[PDB]
Amino acid sequence: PQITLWQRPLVTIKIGGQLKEALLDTGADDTVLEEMSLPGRWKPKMIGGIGGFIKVRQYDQILIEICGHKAIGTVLVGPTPVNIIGRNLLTQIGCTLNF
Amino acid sequence: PQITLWQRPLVTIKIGGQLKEALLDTGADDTVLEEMSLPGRWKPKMIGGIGGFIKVRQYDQILIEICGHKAIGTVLVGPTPVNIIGRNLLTQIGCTLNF
Numbered sequence A, B: 001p002q003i004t005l006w007q008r009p010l011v012t013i014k015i016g017g018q019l020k021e022a023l024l025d026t027g028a029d030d031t032v033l034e035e036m037s038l039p040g041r042w043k044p045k046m047i048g049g050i051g052g053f054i055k056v057r058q059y060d061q062i063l064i065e066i067c068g069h070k071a072i073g074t075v076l077v078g079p080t081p082v083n084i085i086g087r088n089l090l091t092q093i094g095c096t097l098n099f
């Protein structure tokens, strides 16, 4: 589909069998979701945003459905203000910016 | 043009006769640029992202050229790590997310 930006580009994602709302963010290198339980071991990662850095938990090869499009990749979990779908997964679903 | 997301979507913008590099950021509600002087009165504002909030100066009705496309809107100036073109301006150039 084609999404305009008059409002936040929020879409429904499915992860861990649960539906969540997330933001399609071209400004985010990675994907970070609010605190939740994910399978397997995690590795540490520090990500920097507009207001500084936060420590997150990195999980790899996680299945996540975005607007019905299945993706499998790295998902970060931490104190993010909102669920963010970053470029690592946006590329998997073939998302591009157009104007 | 069509911009893929394998790399950060950086573009050249022109503001106040200055050419700067900025990120097309769908996750950003507003546009915020690194410290610089703009004409007119401004009002303080706090914007929050990953890592917390930062204080910025808000200027209204600023003209900016994004990839040759002229747009008018509010521009925030502050200690942002990178120049950000947010939704308030992305809409004006007809930028959409497609997949």
Ligand SMILES: O=C(N[C@H]1c2ccccc2C[C@H]1O)[C@H](OCc1ccccc1F)[C@H](O)[C@@H](O)[C@@H](OCc1ccccc1F)C(=O)N[C@H]1c2ccccc2C[C@H]1O
Residues within 6 Å of the ligand: A023, A025, A026, A027, A028, A029, A030, A031, A032, A047, A048, A049, A050, A051, A081, A082, A084, A086, B023, B025, B026, B027, B028, B029, B030, B031, B032, B047, B048, B049, B050, B081, B082, B084, B086
């Ligand atoms: O942190 C970022 N990337 C990093 C990131 C993100 C996730 C995972 C990894 C990484 C690494 C970086 O690419 C991006 O910033 C550019 C950016 C790029 C590279 C380096 C530093 C940097 F600041 C990101 O798209 C932010 O813009 C956006 O984050 C999502 C978000 C949405 C809504 C509320 C809170 C919130 F947080 C955000 O903070 N939005 C707020 C904002 C921004 C400008 C003006 C106003 C407002 C109000 C909010 O809409």
